[PDB]
Enzyme design. Sequence first.
Site, PDB file in Angstrom:
ATOM      1  N   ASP A 138       0.380  -1.500   0.027  1.00 51.83           N
ATOM      2  CA  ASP A 138      -0.249  -0.176   0.157  1.00 51.83           C
ATOM      3  C   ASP A 138       1.053   1.382   0.136  1.00 51.83           C
ATOM      4  OD1 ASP A 138      -2.620   0.794   1.043  1.00 51.83           O
ATOM      5  OD2 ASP A 138      -2.000   2.468   2.235  1.00 51.83           O
TER       6      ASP A 138
ATOM      7  N   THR B 237      -3.849   4.745  -4.108  1.00 54.71           N
ATOM      8  CA  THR B 237      -3.150   5.423  -3.682  1.00 54.71           C
ATOM      9  C   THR B 237      -1.991   6.009  -3.735  1.00 54.71           C
ATOM     10  OG1 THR B 237      -3.647   4.725  -1.134  1.00 54.71           O
ATOM     11  CG2 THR B 237      -2.261   5.742  -0.824  1.00 54.71           C
ATOM     12  N   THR B 238      -1.228   4.473  -4.556  1.00 52.43           N
ATOM     13  CA  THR B 238       0.361   4.845  -5.712  1.00 52.43           C
ATOM     14  C   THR B 238       0.142   5.201  -6.918  1.00 52.43           C
ATOM     15  OG1 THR B 238       0.823   3.018  -4.743  1.00 52.43           O
ATOM     16  CG2 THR B 238       2.200   3.410  -6.625  1.00 52.43           C
TER      17      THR B 238
ATOM     18  N   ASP C 264      -8.976  -2.446   1.686  1.00 52.22           N
ATOM     19  CA  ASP C 264      -8.904  -1.916   0.372  1.00 52.22           C
ATOM     20  C   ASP C 264      -9.456  -2.806  -0.457  1.00 52.22           C
ATOM     21  OD1 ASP C 264      -6.550  -0.720   0.799  1.00 52.22           O
ATOM     22  OD2 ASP C 264      -4.843  -0.660  -0.747  1.00 52.22           O
TER      23      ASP C 264
HETATM   24  N1  LIG Z   1      -5.649  -7.785 -14.002  1.00 51.39           N
HETATM   25  C1  LIG Z   1      -5.617  -7.173 -14.140  1.00 51.39           C
HETATM   26  N2  LIG Z   1      -4.393  -6.705 -15.699  1.00 51.39           N
HETATM   27  C2  LIG Z   1      -4.080  -5.349 -15.577  1.00 51.39           C
HETATM   28  N3  LIG Z   1      -4.059  -4.281 -14.974  1.00 51.39           N
HETATM   29  C3  LIG Z   1      -4.377  -3.809 -13.846  1.00 51.39           C
HETATM   30  C4  LIG Z   1      -4.930  -5.479 -13.382  1.00 51.39           C
HETATM   31  N4  LIG Z   1      -5.352  -4.953 -11.912  1.00 51.39           N
HETATM   32  C5  LIG Z   1      -4.589  -3.796 -11.554  1.00 51.39           C
HETATM   33  N5  LIG Z   1      -4.559  -3.578 -12.902  1.00 51.39           N
HETATM   34  C6  LIG Z   1      -4.505  -1.754 -12.797  1.00 51.39           C
HETATM   35  O1  LIG Z   1      -2.465  -2.258 -12.281  1.00 51.39           O
HETATM   36  C7  LIG Z   1      -2.747  -0.797 -10.973  1.00 51.39           C
HETATM   37  C8  LIG Z   1      -2.057  -0.394  -9.957  1.00 51.39           C
HETATM   38  O2  LIG Z   1      -2.895  -1.097  -9.374  1.00 51.39           O
HETATM   39  P1  LIG Z   1      -2.564  -0.462  -7.612  1.00 51.39           P
HETATM   40  O3  LIG Z   1      -0.885  -0.128  -7.995  1.00 51.39           O
HETATM   41  O4  LIG Z   1      -2.445  -2.253  -7.384  1.00 51.39           O
HETATM   42  O5  LIG Z   1      -3.421  -0.385  -7.060  1.00 51.39           O
HETATM   43  P2  LIG Z   1      -3.144   1.164  -6.091  1.00 51.39           P
HETATM   44  O6  LIG Z   1      -3.085   2.057  -6.728  1.00 51.39           O
HETATM   45  O7  LIG Z   1      -4.816   1.631  -5.003  1.00 51.39           O
HETATM   46  O8  LIG Z   1      -1.930   1.010  -4.902  1.00 51.39           O
HETATM   47  C9  LIG Z   1      -4.464   0.144 -11.438  1.00 51.39           C
HETATM   48  O9  LIG Z   1      -4.782   1.503 -12.126  1.00 51.39           O
HETATM   49  C10 LIG Z   1      -5.159  -1.043 -12.101  1.00 51.39           C
HETATM   50  O10 LIG Z   1      -6.154  -0.297 -13.364  1.00 51.39           O
HETATM   51 MG   LIG Z   2      -4.930  -0.489  -5.962  1.00 48.56          MG
END
Ligand SMILES: Nc1ncnc2c1ncn2[C@@H]1O[C@H](COP(=O)(O)OP(=O)(O)O)[C@@H](O)[C@H]1O
Ligand SMILES: [Mg+2]
Lengths: 52, 186, 48, 532
Positions: D54, D87-88, D391
């Site tokens: 996170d 958040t990232t 989350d």
């Molecule tokens: N199965 C998937 N295939 C392709 N892209 C994905 C998949 N799951 C999540 N993503 C993308 O990866 C990006 C990063 O998400 P993440 O950084 O894990 O969430 P957060 O920003 O809350 O930490 C998200 O914007 C999402 O669109």
């Molecule tokens: Mg996320």
Amino acid sequence: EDIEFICKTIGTKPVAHIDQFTADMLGSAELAEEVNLNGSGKLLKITGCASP
Amino acid sequence: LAGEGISVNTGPKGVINDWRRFKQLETEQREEQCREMERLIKKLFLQQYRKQRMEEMRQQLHFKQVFEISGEGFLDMIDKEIVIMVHIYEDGTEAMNGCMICLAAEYPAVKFCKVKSSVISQFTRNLLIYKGGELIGNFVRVTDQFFAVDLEAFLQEFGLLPEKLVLTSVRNSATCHSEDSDLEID
Amino acid sequence: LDPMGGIVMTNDGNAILREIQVQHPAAKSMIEISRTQDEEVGDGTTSV
Amino acid sequence: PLSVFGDRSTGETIRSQNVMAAASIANIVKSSLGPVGLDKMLVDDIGDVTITNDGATILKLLEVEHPAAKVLCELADLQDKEVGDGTTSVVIIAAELLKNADELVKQKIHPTSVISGYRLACKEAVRYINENLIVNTDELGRDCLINAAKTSMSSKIIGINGDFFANMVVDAVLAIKYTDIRGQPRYPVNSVNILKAHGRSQMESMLISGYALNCVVGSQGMPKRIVNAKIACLDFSLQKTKMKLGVQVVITDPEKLDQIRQRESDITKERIQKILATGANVILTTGGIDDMCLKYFVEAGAMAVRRVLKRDLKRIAKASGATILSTLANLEGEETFEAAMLGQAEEVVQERICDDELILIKNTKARTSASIILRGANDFMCDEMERSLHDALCVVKRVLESKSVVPGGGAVEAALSIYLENYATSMGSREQLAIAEFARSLLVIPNTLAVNAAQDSTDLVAKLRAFHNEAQVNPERKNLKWIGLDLSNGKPRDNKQAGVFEPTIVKVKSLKFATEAAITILRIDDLIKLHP
Ligand SMILES: Nc1ncnc2c1ncn2[C@@H]1O[C@H](COP(=O)(O)OP(=O)(O)O)[C@@H](O)[C@H]1O
Ligand SMILES: [Mg+2]
Ligand SMILES: [Mg+2]
């Protein structure tokens, strides 16, 4: 320090003894609701007052 | 050689920057010396405690380590944020260190820690207690007057150690805010 | 050798690992794994 | 000349320094984005270890000195507070926006024009998202919620475990659903008590159809299982009665001391007798309980739990229909307890979880409540599971409240970049460059996603942009808006059919917050740092 502002805004006259606590010293309002700011906190709003 | 009434006037005006830059470090050094000298110089069959043994083998039931303090570390550990015992030594020290380690388990409200004597030889050739920023206990060379039970009894006889815990699974708490708990309506 | 001066003479995995202090956090994770295995079933601590 | 006791930076120096700080913060968390992202291991210089993915947690734990870095960290915290996800992404987008804005400024473009262009681009991006890129979840059903939860739990420690964790999250969220006035379905997340305990594997974590207390019975005498529970919630300690400060006992006739001392505990005895006379089976109190009251409860064959957390007690009372009683005082000035204040549950059990015990209040009537018991390998894994679970719960709440979702995998970012770089030429003469730079900076998300998988970012992003350009140019190819990134194979893929969704609120709030943070940092061209 906020007593004067509250009394001016609403119309409530402060009461310092239960003997003088009467209905005429109350400030009527349309709504008094405590709202939340999308998880950023809580605020109590008194919106709409007779004789504002 | 006359004119002793100099009235230096705006002379020091042009040197306030350098004077204050030196004065900040001078004040920091004076504060460090005062905190160092706060402890030093100032003062530099029931009778056999049958409960000592039971406290001994009930203390072992918990292992982390005491924090090792960096001259400004001593300053800013007590300057901010309770009873705190600080150990002064240079590498009987190991025995009392183990005593402090054992006692820290039963006293989560205390801030058991150790610090080198060199960073802070008249007091070195041959246990500091703080609470809320003010000194409480100033026992120096405690070997003259060991086990964790003995140290606990010695600190409690002076009324310094707090007087007296179920074990959770691991932990429960996550945060503390406007959780918006469930409010059943209609 | 207990830092408090005692002696622990054993061959249990959890007993050995619990008395070892390490700096690398991966070793801390492994020690916590040993403790979890000991607390859950009480056997197979070296095996895990 | 100034004679100010401090240091001063002015011009390109301070701007470059601020962009440096923002870029450093972005690069800290850039490696934990997307399903091919990896976790981080933080050490708190006293031996405490934290493992997390996170962004908000990482930025909160790190020590930050530069004001712009602090701004970005607070931005991440605000994004976590107001949305709970992305958040990232918001931090990365804000840092890229600041970098491109400073690149424009270094070309003698006035910062006011850049700020105006950024504001216009953000407004147009939000409008375009709402008009085109949203997908209504009414016709999707529970599958949409499951897919949103799975997408949220990607990149987390419970990723492959998603097939089960998504079902658990959806069930937990739906269990706590309630409708307030105006007929608005409200989902009070954080009312789901998440309990952690190491031991068994992830697959066999428990979802409680009730509530879970991290407490045990006060004494071994009472039974640890009651079938037809009658929960009585109290907000006061059940101990020996002690007079307040204003009351003082002075004895002149010695014959009354024994009566005084006996009454001193008979008061509490009578209170407990009144409580138990109504048929109460389980008694929960926030205050303590001493030995004599525990003996009373033991003899009555009931349960007594002390030091119950206030929020837990409130949730239990709301779920079981009980009412918190800070005192047994009625409107007649008497001391009475009525059965109407009793809450009922189908079962109360003290279950054993990995050499420790906790109380399960199973199947409370008059209201449905949920709790999750996370089982893992150690404390760090359980904590990371809890963060990921929170989350996912926040994502599901956002999806259920606002019924619009957008495709994930950077499809929204690519579509926004194409549309904004096309729209920048419509109006403006100098803010056109600002809008174009906004569009270009919006591409940092798919770029980072591709980099994290060790795939060719240039070709993947070029193909994505070509697909979205064809979608935006040819009216009959509008179905290509959902073409996202498939990181498993490193090829573009229609994410709408693949089941990769995010709430629209996440993207909208991230864009707004990042734009505001970039504007705030962009206004500074002079720094004065006074010596302490
Ligand atoms: N199965 C998937 N295939 C392709 N892209 C994905 C998949 N799951 C999540 N993503 C993308 O990866 C990006 C990063 O998400 P993440 O950084 O894990 O969430 P957060 O920003 O809350 O930490 C998200 O914007 C999402 O669109
Ligand atoms: Mg996320
Ligand atoms: Mg064995």
